[PDB]
């Protein structure tokens, strides 16, 4: 697990991977953890499996009752703010919860909210959660260009995952990039990590420390 | 064992002398009447006599 | 694992399953578990796989010593009586439930003992998980005074007891006949129940299927002299 | 948190060609003080079914009544499911389990376990389990607790299978459960010399003797039993 | 598991079941609880079952030597030896003996250790954990100085109530008998009380 | 956590005809962040080859152990030692230390000198010889392992058929488990030859 | 004290193919090492050509396919019998489970079906809730023996092209509803001979454009 | 705990330690040395459990000198990783053990190579070409895995290892002052004074 | 304590034993541990206290509604009003309640219940602190349906070996008569039951 | 973390909180602030424990709030914390608490007077020339009770915070990068930003 975000000039990259483990013991490798809450909100799966899957599609719920009574697309301020109220009330029954809701409207631009059990909301520019959250920010925060194109945006949301994948044990499977735009998500398809990995080491040259 | 590298050929040699300079030394017990040449290889200085 | 050891009025016959676990996990299909303090007392065991290997191998050890330091036979009693008191004072932190068996000049014994040092006595006395099961066959068929011909029927159906519904228990069925003033005979895999069927298609693969990243040749072989 | 107070235990049970057998110890023990003797807990339902249950004696009395009241629940109206259109082993079965897995739920079940066992109105054995986690199964031979792997076995030789129903007739079957109740009155240290034997036959209805001694016990290989040395 | 041992005219009377329960499952069912310490003095067993036998060994290790160099040990010696081993690995080794024997010169006498382990004569013992359902039973109908038929007659019919009230006691009742006429074991199978 | 499963490790064996294999992961771990993709787990004196699984430093100590006790075996008899005779000495390191044990799982695999016959044993914590002539497999993949090596191997397999099987067995339990992978090496034992063929393989 | 879960053991296998559906399942119920039955279905037709098993702790597992049909009923009556979808199955099954997450149920669940298009479609769900679409999922406690064998002779993984040494993958082919019996009969195999809750007998339902075949073979008897 | 990387570049370990320490609640100086000089080419850092390291520190360091005024010639990077290995290993097994990781870099002169090395509180000994203990690993292994090369410069390396503190810097929610570098190369055991 | 009830052929006799004891200390050596519940059907508590007494008043408040709508209640119906009240707070409360009434119809009975509440018909029965070790000695000398003053002495022995063994049981032995004539009272001081 | 501090002058309430947020083993925001309006002459910075800062900033915001529309009074920075220690007081009792320490910080327009009032989790206020919270509160107190004067100038509080800010940086063991100051004036509430 090890999932990140970061707002440029065209939107936020989302980036997830694939790898759900039951421990020792990996579960499956294609597990999306990409959520399409309607068609201008993705939300990240972390933590709780389950509990992000299920209160997710319940927030597609809110964001339809949303969107009816004012006839206007929602805030995704607003979007984060009803999620946040849900989990507060379950703490102390001990669900656990790490997501990311992604958004771009017209009217606020990018903004990403970080929605978690504790009730704790925290807007911001890049996060990475999981358990190899730790990985994935060297790579991307030495790199980071607000100023940054769409091509080169997508390489860099990739090979932060691949660094996070490498050593951590949870983390494979295969990796799905998005693209949220204004007008919607677009889908950059599915790489597997473990043919990405090659690719990546004779063009770019790094990682002199692994075998080949 | 400890070091992961052969033994050279002069510590092995001090430490054959040091236990039969021991019963001379002390105890009572008669010494062994024994004389080696070593024979032996070492990265260090090669062969030794 | 089912492990019965039943006397008769000629000898003794003691038997048990080749199935040898490690946790769920089925270690061995096949393996002893039968072993051979003496070439006239034989013990099987249960409890902790490890420690039924070890303490057999080492009251082994002493016997074989003491039958050769008094140039007699080495009696069931002597063995047992080792055992027994060596078990004592860990006070029950080696795992070994044992089955012991086996013939001397002064007649037919089969005992069993516990991991601390408990001891009992029958005719017919089972050890192991599968003891439950074992136990019940044979107390409906037994009776005093059985040949050796009903014996060893009656050790088989009794492990074969074992294996349908225990599941610790499973695979072959392995015998040992003694009597006494007879040689003491190995049966190694007498029974044989679940017999593996034909796999559905092999799995056998063309030359190349997987990726070599590099070979080497790397020497067994000491230096040399040309 | 719940505990058994008193205890009854074993209740064996096996299929036969016509028909099934039931039979259980009664005997209520109290861990190590042997309490009570004489205690029925083959509690005839109908006339096509015994019910035989076992663990805590508290939580048998209290599914005792219950078994009553469902037979005088199907009496009120219906003057044609006199014994005709009645209960069947199968409804008196499902009633029973979803009380308990009802209780599972809440954390305080009925500890105990039941074996149903009747010839249903199509003419078809049945021959199940509840237990007090709510586990059903199904199964040709059957005991509870401790002749799970003591009694079970034994009666394992005989009705093997689904391909053997039609081979173990009713002299080969009181024979087997005889034998096991021995082994039990052997091996177990809750069994009491006392046991019920009913025969569900259904061209003979449910006969239904009570008092059984276990007979035929060997303890004569006792006295060449001396010390260890 | 019930022991007892009594004291009559001719010496005393030892008796014992031979059901050793662990747990729900009966591991021995013909347990044979009276051992043979010297041979003239034979005890009972009960408690931790390999703590016992362990101990046993050893009493006999030390009466076996006691005989061979300084003479013939009495039921007061061996009961002896048998606390001190209790007394002083009194935390773990846990230990009922009843120590019953036939001297040629004091006749017969019980000891009862529990499992501090501290002697006391008595002229019965009981001891075990299947004799607490007959404690009321033995007080009332027992006189101390019975005949020999009379004796028999009064463990059999304890040990068939210990059978009936506690599960832990079972199978055949086992008397070993110490006079001065010897050492004559008897054997009483179930229908034989079950009778009564 | 587990103390046998804080840094995993695999190690597969397989017999065949007139040959053997064994091969093992080359992943050190400290939990979850990878350490190292270039430790060995297999080691061999003489023409034996011990593999060894389980924490990471015992499997280390132990190989400096048997170094020792193989040196003074071929000194004093004046040959290098028999696998069969071998595992007897792995047995008995192991249970010296019965209380507070190695916490190791070691596979012997070799072929006998002095009969041909391809012969291979395993341990546990405490050891237990487990006898085979199939295959035994030990460490942290291991439930994986016994399932996926019985259903492709067919008793008895040529020197090279034997190098696909094992190949396999090793790549794909180590891709459905965490603490395994990450690059492997397979070796290919006959008579006289050994060859030691890195594998390319999922790093990811 | 009352611990309410317990274990019946048991091994369940879904295989999504392309023009039928495989959900299969051993028959052996278990409580420790005694076998309590030979023989107990654990995959349940629904109807609509869905078949679900609820593997695991039988009285949990039991309950939660009573509760599944019961809503399989009760949308056939309010929706002038309407033909269930496995996609709305699917997330009917997620309510079921998730709305017990302060006393959660412990069964591991599988469905299996055809989708719309005319393939084969399997959702594996865990006891908490969350769900995702599978061409594989084993389940159960021979799980770990039985999926990697099946990831290897379907999806073809880390298998290259012979002699080419890395540079191409192995091309994945489509599999016959004959072939994929042969699969799934001889993994039982293999998971008999190494596996202790496995045996007696398997199941197989095999869900295509016509109807729901049983087919029933017996494995190692222990 | 505390800071602790090495690389280990074509001609030099470049080896580095936090200057801070915090014991009780409050940093109590701010400028301590972790490392000892074993031999002349031969450097040891470590942090770990306040107080065994300071004594596993100085035990071995007594001991690889006393080897080195035997025979005037210094051990090797590999054999001082290796006794270095045995220790740690006795001490777990022992009633108290040392709970105190620690890099080992050297340059050996026999083989006329640069050489860095990983022992962990356990006893695992791994040859590396650039290693990290504790919580500090994470952020930095990942970052290393982009930039590294193997035949770099000293100087290239240093501004490599300037990057790496300061990622730490800000992600890490642990303060350490920057380090302390200390270079190990052919003609010394060098330091650095910029961060 | 030690509280008995035991049958003959007039009526049941019912008995008890007057020591309470918190820890070693007794509470009050004179309690009246034998309770009127209905006229005619009498109770035995053993166990806690408080328990017992909470649980005797509310079947007294349930047979004085019982007796002034429905008529007179037999030992039966009083029997289940207790069992009930002991299963549905068998893990708040214990209990030990053993029943004894006359019916007219049925002449004396005798139930018991233990504490998770079960109704067992006997025709003697035991419960309390001290019935462990009268067992065996009840089951020998129990007849039926023998004469009023053989039954006045076998309680009179049974208690009277309670109160040897058992620390927590002694006093007074209480009797109560429950015959078609009547209640009697009976009680014995130490000195006449100490012989006997 | 949960440094959260005041300074009394007399003519202004100068509270600064903390830019960092931890949580987990990283920092995810070291650019963030914790402080709300009540009013728009009462301020009230917020620190302690995880998730119950935003939800019990907001609850009280939007109480306040509606008071202050309803009858376009501001409320006494007195009247404020008095409701603020009421709820905190309640839920101890009550089956879910709230761990959070408060200042609030205003500048009450009856009396034209500066009044600080420090609000534990236990729900006391107690009216202080200067306060703080949390074992970051030691460091900070001594510094305040030498070199403090009750005739203060707003600029002479700045350069006071500057001390205490010094002081931080050097003892705390860990990272909370630097402050942003807020100023309770008597013209609104006007953010600085300290150097």
Same mark, same amino acid.
């Given at each position: 697990?090890?999932?990140?975000?970061?707002?440029?000039?065209?939107? #936020?990259?989302?980036?997830?991977?694939?790898?759900?483990?039951?421990?020792?013991?990996?579960?499956?490798?294609?597990?999306?953890?990409?959520?399409? #809450?309607? $068609?201008?909100?993705?939300?990240?799966?972390?933590?709780?499996?389950?509990?992000?899957?299920?209160?997710?599609?319940?927030?597609?719920?809110?964001?339809?009752?949303?969107?009816?009574?004012?006839?206007?697309?929602?805030?995704?301020?607003?979007?984060?703010?009803?999620?946040?109220?849900?989990?507060?009330?379950?703490?102390?029954?001990?669900?656990?919860?790490?997501?990311?809701?992604?958004?771009?409207?017209?009217?606020?631009? $990018?903004?990403?909210?970080?929605?978690?059990?504790?009730?704790?909301?925290?807007?911001?520019?890049?996060?990475?959660?999981?358990?190899?959250?730790?990985?994935?920010?060297?790579?991307?925060?030495?790199?980071?260009?607000?100023?940054?194109?769409?091509?080169?945006?997508?390489?860099?949301?990739?090979?932060?995952?691949?660094?996070?994948?490498?050593?951590?044990?949870?983390?494979?499977?295969?990796?799905?990039?998005?693209?949220?735009?204004?007008?919607?998500?677009?889908?950059?398809?599915?790489?597997?990590?473990?043919?990405?990995?090659?690719?990546?080491?004779?063009?770019?040259?790094?990682?002199?420390?692994?075998?080949? | 064992?400890?070091?992961?590298?052969?033994?050279?050929?002069?510590?092995?040699?001090?430490?054959?002398?040091?236990?039969?300079?021991?019963?001379?030394?002390?105890?009572?017990?008669?010494?062994?009447?024994?004389?080696?040449?070593?024979?032996?290889?070492?990265?260090?200085?090669?062969?030794?006599? | 694992?089912?492990?019965?050891?039943?006397?008769?009025?000629?000898?003794?016959?003691?038997?048990?399953?080749?199935?040898?676990?490690?946790?769920?996990?089925?270690?061995?299909?096949?393996?002893?578990?039968?072993?051979?303090?003496?070439?006239?007392?034989?013990?099987?065991?249960?409890?902790?796989?490890?420690?039924?290997?070890?303490?057999?191998?080492?009251?082994?050890?002493?016997?074989? *010593?003491?039958?050769?330091?008094?140039?007699?036979?080495?009696?069931?009693?002597?063995?047992?009586?080792?055992?027994?008191?060596?078990?004592?004072?860990?006070?029950?932190?080696?795992?070994?439930? *044992?089955?012991?068996?086996?013939?001397?000049?002064?007649?037919?014994?089969?005992?069993?003992?516990?991991?601390?040092?408990?001891?009992?006595?029958?005719?017919?006395?089972?050890?192991?998980?599968?003891?439950?099961?074992?136990?019940?066959?044979?107390?409906?068929?037994?009776?005093?005074?059985?040949?050796?011909?009903?014996?060893?029927?009656?050790?088989?159906?009794?492990?074969?007891?074992?294996?349908?519904?225990? *599941?610790?228990?499973?695979?072959?069925?392995?015998?040992?006949?003694?009597?006494?003033?007879?040689?003491?005979?190995?049966?190694?895999?007498?029974?044989?129940?679940?017999?593996?069927?034909?796999?559905?298609?092999?799995?056998?693969?063309?030359?190349?299927?997987?990726?070599?990243?590099?070979?080497?040749?790397?020497?067994?072989?000491?230096?040399?002299?040309? | 948190?719940?505990?058994?107070?008193?205890?009854?235990? +074993?209740?064996?049970?096996?299929?036969?060609?016509?028909?099934?057998?039931?039979?259980?110890?009664?005997?209520?023990?109290?861990?190590?003080?042997?309490?009570?003797?004489?205690?029925?807990?083959?509690?005839?339902?109908?006339?096509?079914?015994?019910?035989?249950?076992?663990?805590?004696?508290?939580?048998?009395?209290?599914?005792?009544?219950?078994?009553?009241?469902?037979?005088?629940?199907?009496?009120?109206?219906?003057?044609?499911?006199?014994?005709?259109?009645?209960?069947?082993?199968?409804?008196?079965?499902?009633?029973?389990?979803?009380?308990?897995?009802?209780?599972?739920?809440?954390?305080?079940?009925?500890?105990?376990?039941?074996?149903?066992?009747?010839?249903?109105?199509?003419?078809?054995?049945?021959?199940?389990?509840?237990?007090?986690?709510?586990?059903?199964?199904?199964?040709?031979?059957?005991?509870?607790?401790?002749?799970?792997?003591?009694?079970?076995?034994?009666?394992?030789?005989?009705?093997?299978?689904?391909?053997?129903?039609?081979?173990?007739?009713?002299?080969?079957?009181?024979?087997?459960?005889?034998?096991?109740?021995?082994?039990?009155?052997?091996?177990?240290?809750? +069994?009491?010399?006392?046991?019920?034997?009913?025969?569900?036959?259904?061209?003979?209805?449910?006969?239904?003797?009570?008092?059984?001694?276990?007979?035929?016990?060997?303890?004569?290989?006792?006295?060449?039993?001396?010390?260890?040395? | 598991?019930?022991?007892?041992?009594?004291?009559?005219?001719?010496?005393?009377?030892?008796?014992?079941?031979?059901?050793?329960?662990?747990?729900?499952?009966?591991?021995?069912?013909?347990?044979?609880?009276?051992?043979?310490?010297?041979?003239?003095?034979?005890?009972?067993?009960?408690?931790?079952?390999?703590?016992?036998?362990?101990?046993?060994?050893?009493?006999?290790?030390?009466?076996?030597?006691?005989?061979?160099?300084?003479?013939?040990?009495?039921?007061?010696?061996?009961?002896?030896?048998?606390?001190?081993?209790?007394?002083?690995?009194?935390?773990?080794?846990?230990?009922?003996?009843?120590?019953?024997?036939?001297?040629?010169?004091?006749?017969?006498?019980?000891?009862?250790?529990?499992?501090?382990?501290?002697?006391?004569?008595?002229?019965?013992?009981?001891?075990?954990?299947?004799?607490?359902?007959?404690?009321?039973?033995?007080?009332?109908?027992?006189?101390?100085?019975?005949?020999?038929?009379?004796?028999?007659?009064?463990?059999?019919?304890?040990?068939?109530?210990?059978?009936?009230?506690?599960?832990?006691?079972?199978?055949?009742?086992?008397?070993?008998?110490?006079?001065?006429?010897?050492?004559?074991?008897?054997?009483?199978?179930?229908?034989?009380?079950?009778?009564? | 956590?587990?103390?046998?499963?804080?840094?995993?490790?695999?190690?597969?064996?397989?017999?065949?005809?007139?040959?053997?294999?064994?091969?093992?992961?080359?992943?050190?771990?400290?939990?979850?962040?990878? =350490?190292?993709?270039?430790?060995?787990?297999?080691?061999?004196?003489?023409? =034996?080859?011990?593999?060894?699984?389980?924490?990471?430093?015992?499997?280390?100590?132990?190989?400096?152990?048997?170094?020792?006790?193989?040196?003074?075996?071929?000194?004093?008899?004046?040959?290098?030692?028999?696998?069969?005779?071998?595992?007897?000495?792995?047995?008995?390191?192991?249970?010296?230390?019965?209380?507070?044990?190695?916490?190791?799982?070691?596979?012997?695999?070799?072929?006998?000198?002095?009969?041909?016959?391809?012969?291979?044993?395993?341990?546990?914590?405490?050891?237990?010889?487990?006898?085979?002539?199939?295959?035994?497999?030990?460490?942290?993949?291991?439930?994986?392992?016994?399932?996926?090596?019985?259903?492709?191997?067919?008793?008895?397999?040529?020197?090279?058929?034997?190098?696909?099987?094992?190949?396999?067995?090793?790549?794909?339990?180590?891709?459905?488990?965490?603490?395994?992978?990450?690059?492997?090496?397979?070796?290919?034992?006959?008579?006289?030859?050994?060859?030691?063929?890195?594998?390319?393989?999922?790093?990811? | 004290?009352?611990?309410?879960?317990?274990?019946?053991?048991?091994?369940?296998?879904?295989?999504?193919?392309?023009?039928?559906?495989?959900?299969?399942?051993?028959?052996?119920?278990?409580?420790?090492?005694?076998?309590?039955?030979?023989?107990?279905?654990?995959?349940?037709?629904?109807?609509?050509?869905?078949?679900?098993?609820?593997?695991?702790?039988?009285?949990?597992?039991?309950?939660?396919?009573?509760?599944?049909?019961?809503?399989?009923?009760?949308?056939?009556?309010?929706?002038?019998?309407?033909?269930?979808?496995?996609?709305?199955?699917?997330?009917?099954?997620?309510?079921?489970?998730?709305?017990?997450?302060?006393?959660?149920?412990?069964?591991? %669940?599988?469905?299996?079906?055809?989708?719309?298009?005319?393939?084969?479609?399997?959702?594996?769900?865990?006891?908490?809730?969350?769900?995702?679409?599978?061409?594989?999922?084993?389940?159960?406690?021979?799980?770990?023996?039985?999926?990697?064998?099946?990831?290897?002779?379907?999806?073809?993984?880390?298998?290259?092209?012979?002699? %080419?040494?890395?540079?191409?993958?192995?091309?994945?082919?489509?599999?016959?509803?004959?072939?994929?019996?042969?699969?799934?009969?001889?993994?039982?195999?293999?998971?008999?001979?190494?596996?202790?809750?496995?045996?007696?007998?398997?199941?197989?339902?095999?869900?295509?454009?016509?109807?729901?075949?049983?087919?029933?073979?017996?494995?190692?008897?222990? | 705990?505390?800071?602790?990387?090495?690389?280990?570049?074509?001609?030099?370990?470049?080896?580095?330690?936090?200057?801070?320490?915090?014991?009780?609640?409050?940093?109590?100086?701010?400028?301590?040395?972790?490392?000892?000089?074993?031999?002349?080419?031969?450097?040891?850092?470590?942090?770990?459990?306040?107080?065994?390291?300071?004594?596993?520190?100085?035990?071995?360091?007594?001991?690889?000198?006393?080897?080195?005024?035997?025979?005037?010639?210094?051990?090797?990077?590999?054999?001082?990783?290796?006794?270095?290995?045995?220790?740690?290993?006795?001490?777990?097994?022992?009633?108290?053990?040392?709970?105190?990781?620690?890099?080992?870099?050297?340059?050996?002169?026999?083989?006329?190579?640069?050489?860095?090395?990983?022992?962990?509180?356990?006893?695992?000994?791994?040859?590396?070409?650039?290693?990290?203990?504790?919580?500090?690993?994470?952020?930095?292994?990942?970052?290393?895995?982009?930039?590294?090369?193997?035949?770099?410069?000293?100087?290239?390396?240093?501004?490599?290892?300037?990057?790496?503190?300061?990622?730490?810097?800000?992600?890490?929610?642990?303060?350490?002052?920057?380090?302390?570098?200390?270079?190990?190369?052919?003609?010394?055991?060098?330091?650095?004074?910029?961060?």
């Amino acid at each position: 697990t090890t999932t990140l975000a970061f707002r440029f000039q065209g939107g #936020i990259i989302v980036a997830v991977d694939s790898r759900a483990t039951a421990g020792n013991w990996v579960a499956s490798q294609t597990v999306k953890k990409v959520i399409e #809450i309607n $068609p201008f909100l993705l939300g990240t799966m972390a933590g709780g499996a389950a509990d992000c899957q299920f209160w997710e599609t319940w927030l597609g719920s809110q964001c339809r009752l949303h969107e009816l009574r004012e006839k206007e697309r929602i805030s995704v301020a607003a979007a984060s703010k009803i999620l946040s109220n849900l989990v507060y009330q379950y703490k102390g029954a001990g669900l656990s919860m790490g997501t990311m809701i992604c958004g771009y409207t017209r009217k606020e631009g $990018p903004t990403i909210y970080y929605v978690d059990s504790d009730g704790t909301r925290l807007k911001g520019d890049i996060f990475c959660v999981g358990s190899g959250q730790t990985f994935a920010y060297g790579v991307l925060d030495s790199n980071y260009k607000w100023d940054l194109s769409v091509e080169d945006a997508l390489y860099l949301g990739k090979r932060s995952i691949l660094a996070a994948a490498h050593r951590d044990a949870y983390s494979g499977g295969s990796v799905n990039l998005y693209h949220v735009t204004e007008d919607g998500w677009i889908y950059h398809g599915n790489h597997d990590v473990g043919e990405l990995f090659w690719k990546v080491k004779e063009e770019e040259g790094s990682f002199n420390n692994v075998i080949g | 064992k400890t070091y992961n590298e052969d033994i050279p050929v002069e510590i092995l040699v001090r430490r054959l002398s040091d236990i039969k300079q021991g019963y001379t030394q002390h105890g009572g017990l008669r010494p062994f009447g024994v004389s080696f040449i070593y024979a032996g290889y070492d990265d260090r200085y090669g062969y030794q006599l | 694992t089912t492990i019965v050891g039943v006397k008769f009025n000629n000898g003794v016959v003691i038997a048990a399953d080749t199935r040898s676990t490690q946790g769920p996990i089925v270690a061995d299909k096949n393996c002893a578990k039968l072993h051979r303090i003496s070439p006239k007392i034989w013990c099987a065991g249960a409890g902790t796989a490890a420690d039924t290997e070890a303490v057999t191998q080492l009251i082994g050890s002493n016997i074989e *010593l003491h039958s050769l330091y008094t140039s007699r036979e080495p009696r069931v009693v002597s063995a047992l009586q080792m055992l027994k008191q060596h078990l004592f004072k860990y006070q029950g932190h080696i795992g070994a439930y *044992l089955i012991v068996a086996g013939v001397d000049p002064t007649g037919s014994h089969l005992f069993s003992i516990h991991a601390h040092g408990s001891t009992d006595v029958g005719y017919y006395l089972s050890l192991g998980s599968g003891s439950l099961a074992a136990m019940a066959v044979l107390e409906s068929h037994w009776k005093q005074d059985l040949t050796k011909e009903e014996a060893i029927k009656l050790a088989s159906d009794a492990i074969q007891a074992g294996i349908w519904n225990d *599941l610790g228990s499973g695979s072959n069925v392995d015998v040992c006949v003694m009597e006494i003033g007879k040689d003491a005979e190995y049966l190694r895999n007498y029974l044989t129940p679940n017999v593996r069927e034909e796999k559905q298609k092999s799995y056998k693969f063309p030359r190349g299927t997987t990726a070599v990243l590099k070979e080497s040749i790397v020497n067994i072989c000491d230096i040399q002299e040309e | 948190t719940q505990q058994p107070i008193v205890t009854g235990t +074993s209740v064996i049970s096996m299929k036969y060609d016509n028909g099934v057998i039931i039979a259980a110890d009664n005997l209520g023990s109290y861990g190590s003080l042997l309490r009570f003797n004489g205690v029925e807990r083959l509690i005839p339902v109908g006339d096509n079914t015994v019910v035989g249950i076992s663990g805590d004696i508290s939580d048998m009395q209290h599914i005792e009544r219950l078994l009553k009241d469902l037979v005088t629940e199907n009496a009120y109206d219906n003057p044609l499911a006199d014994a005709e259109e009645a209960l069947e082993p199968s409804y008196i079965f499902e009633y029973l389990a979803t009380v308990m897995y009802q209780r599972r739920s809440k954390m305080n079940p009925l500890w105990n376990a039941i074996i149903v066992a009747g010839v249903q109105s199509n003419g078809d054995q049945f021959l199940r389990y509840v237990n007090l986690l709510g586990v059903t199964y199904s199964s040709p031979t059957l005991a509870t607790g401790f002749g799970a792997h003591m009694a079970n076995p034994l009666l394992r030789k005989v009705v093997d299978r689904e391909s053997d129903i039609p081979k173990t007739t009713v002299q080969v079957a009181e024979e087997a459960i005889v034998n096991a109740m021995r082994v039990l009155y052997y091996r177990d240290a809750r +069994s009491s010399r006392n046991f019920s034997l009913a025969i569900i036959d259904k061209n003979t209805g449910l006969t239904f003797k009570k008092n059984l001694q276990v007979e035929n016990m060997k303890w004569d290989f006792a006295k060449d039993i001396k010390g260890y040395g | 598991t019930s022991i007892m041992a009594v004291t009559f005219k001719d010496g005393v009377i030892l008796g014992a079941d031979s059901r050793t329960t662990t747990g729900a499952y009966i591991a021995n069912r013909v347990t044979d609880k009276l051992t043979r310490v010297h041979d003239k003095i034979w005890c009972c067993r009960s408690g931790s079952a390999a703590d016992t036998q362990a101990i046993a060994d050893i009493v006999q290790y030390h009466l076996e030597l006691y005989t061979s160099q300084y003479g013939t040990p009495s039921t007061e010696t061996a009961a002896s030896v048998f606390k001190e081993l209790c007394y002083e690995n009194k935390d773990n080794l846990t230990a009922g003996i009843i120590v019953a024997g036939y001297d040629d010169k004091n006749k017969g006498e019980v000891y009862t250790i529990p499992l501090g382990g501290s002697v006391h004569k008595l002229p019965y013992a009981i001891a075990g954990s299947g004799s607490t359902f007959i404690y009321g039973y033995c007080d009332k109908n027992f006189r101390e100085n019975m005949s020999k038929e009379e004796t028999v007659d009064f463990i059999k019919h304890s040990l068939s109530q210990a059978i009936k009230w506690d599960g832990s006691s079972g199978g055949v009742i086992r008397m070993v008998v110490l006079t001065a006429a010897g050492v004559e074991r008897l054997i009483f199978y179930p229908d034989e009380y079950e009778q009564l | 956590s587990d103390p046998s499963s804080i840094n995993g490790g695999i190690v597969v064996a397989m017999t065949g005809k007139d040959c053997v294999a064994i091969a093992c992961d080359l992943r050190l771990g400290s939990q979850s962040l990878g =350490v190292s993709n270039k430790f060995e787990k297999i080691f061999h004196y003489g023409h =034996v080859f011990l593999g060894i699984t389980g924490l990471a430093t015992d499997v280390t100590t132990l190989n400096e152990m048997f170094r020792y006790k193989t040196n003074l075996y071929k000194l004093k008899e004046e040959r290098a030692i028999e696998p069969e005779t071998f595992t007897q000495l792995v047995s008995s390191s192991l249970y010296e230390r019965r209380f507070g044990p190695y916490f190791v799982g070691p596979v012997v695999a070799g072929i006998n000198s002095k009969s041909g016959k391809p012969f291979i044993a395993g341990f546990d914590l405490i050891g237990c010889i487990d006898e085979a002539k199939d295959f035994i497999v030990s460490g942290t993949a291991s439930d994986q392992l016994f399932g996926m090596c019985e259903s492709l191997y067919e008793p008895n397999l040529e020197p090279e058929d034997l190098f696909e099987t094992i190949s396999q067995a090793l790549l794909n339990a180590a891709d459905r488990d965490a603490l395994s992978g990450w690059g492997a090496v397979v070796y290919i034992i006959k008579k006289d030859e050994v060859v030691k063929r890195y594998l390319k393989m999922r790093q990811d | 004290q009352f611990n309410p879960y317990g274990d019946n053991g048991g091994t369940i296998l879904g295989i999504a193919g392309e023009d039928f559906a495989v959900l299969a399942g051993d028959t052996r119920n278990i409580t420790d090492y005694s076998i309590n039955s030979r023989y107990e279905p654990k995959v349940f037709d629904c109807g609509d050509n869905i078949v679900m098993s609820a593997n695991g702790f039988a009285a949990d597992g039991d309950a939660l396919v009573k509760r599944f049909k019961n809503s399989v009923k009760w949308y056939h009556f309010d929706h002038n019998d309407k033909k269930l979808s496995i996609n709305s199955a699917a997330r009917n099954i997620q309510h079921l489970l998730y709305g017990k997450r302060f006393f959660p149920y412990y069964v591991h %669940t599988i469905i299996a079906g055809l989708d719309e298009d005319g393939k084969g479609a399997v959702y594996s769900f865990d006891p908490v809730g969350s769900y995702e679409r599978e061409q594989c999922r084993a389940g159960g406690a021979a799980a770990s023996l039985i999926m990697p064998f099946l990831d290897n002779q379907v999806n073809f993984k880390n298998q290259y092209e012979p002699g %080419t040494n890395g540079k191409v993958k192995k091309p994945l082919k489509y599999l016959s509803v004959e072939e994929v019996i042969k699969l799934v009969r001889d993994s039982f195999t293999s998971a008999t001979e190494r596996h202790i809750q496995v045996g007696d007998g398997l199941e197989i339902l095999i869900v295509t454009k016509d109807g729901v075949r049983k087919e029933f073979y017996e494995l190692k008897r222990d | 705990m505390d800071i602790i990387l090495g690389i280990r570049v074509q001609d030099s370990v470049i080896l580095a330690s936090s200057k801070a320490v915090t014991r009780g609640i409050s940093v109590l100086k701010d400028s301590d040395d972790k490392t000892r000089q074993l031999s002349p080419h031969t450097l040891m850092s470590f942090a770990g459990e306040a107080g065994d390291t300071v004594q596993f520190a100085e035990y071995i360091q007594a001991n690889i000198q006393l080897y080195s005024i035997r025979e005037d010639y210094e051990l090797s990077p590999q054999a001082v990783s290796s006794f270095v290995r045995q220790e740690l290993a006795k001490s777990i097994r022992s009633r108290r053990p040392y709970q105190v990781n620690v890099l080992i870099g050297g340059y050996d002169k026999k083989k006329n190579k640069p050489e860095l090395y990983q022992i962990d509180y356990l006893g695992t000994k791994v040859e590396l070409p650039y290693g990290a203990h504790g919580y500090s690993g994470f952020y930095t292994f990942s970052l290393l895995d982009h930039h590294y090369r193997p035949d770099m410069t000293t100087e290239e390396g240093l501004d490599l290892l300037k990057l790496c503190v300061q990622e730490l810097e800000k992600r890490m929610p642990m303060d350490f002052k920057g380090v302390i570098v200390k270079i190990v190369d052919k003609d010394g055991i060098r330091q650095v004074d910029d961060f």
